Structure 1
């Protein structure tokens, strides 16, 4: 996807609850550094819901694309209160930025 477009999407819709940098602080949600290739709910020091911790899947392009379309549907009981990015293209650009900014 388009990393530059994804960044603006992140700043507009995710930044209020997330940081991406290495050593980043947990805000409402967990810092996202090292997200790709890691199982759900593994950010150090963040108190996840049992649901986010128990999902058991590995975060990558396919799982993130599905999750971000409708967070609560993918992880029922999650405390991430966000409706989701409905447009596929916008979601792909965001994933591209996420992959570039979290490693």
Structure 2
């Protein structure tokens, strides 16, 4: 899932040297995009959007990825239940 869904930017482990989406590492009592990313440098962290929830279930279930209200163009994925397994994997990795 994560491998092709949401690998391009993100990671989950290791290095986080560069670029992209830094790794989420744990979405179960997180507040915003918070990791050893730098990158939240002008929004989300200041908002402090709590990630331990129900609205997230929907927001992550859909190709939308946003507890804070909004949007879409991660971009025509669609479907089913990729998030379920992903959040499962993060549970096993984190919890």
TM-score range for the pair, normalised by the shorter chain length: 0.5 to 0.7
**Structure 1 or 2: more strand by fraction:** 2
The answer as to whether partners of 1:40 and 1:52 remain within 8 angstroms in 2 is yes
The answer as to whether partners of 2:55 and 2:67 remain within 8 angstroms in 1 is no
Query: Which 5+ residue runs of structure 1 have no aligned equivalent?
Result: 1-8
Aligned to 2:65: 71
Runs of 4+ in structure 1 over 6 Å off: none
Question: What RMSD, in angstroms, separates the aligned Cα atoms of the two structures?
Answer: 3.3
1:1-103 paired onto structure 2 within 5 Å: 9-21=1-13, 23-25=14-16, 27-48=19-40, 50-60=42-52, 62-68=54-60, 69=62, 70-71=64-65, 74=68, 76=70, 82-83=74-75, 86-102=78-94
The answer as to whether partners of 1:20 and 1:102 remain within 8 angstroms in 2 is no
TM-score by length of 2: 0.65
**Structure 1 or 2: more helix by fraction:** 1
TM-score by length of 1: 0.61
Higher RCO (C-alpha under 8 Å, 6+ residues apart): 1
Distance 1:76 1:90 in 2: 19
Q: Number of aligned pairs?
A: 92
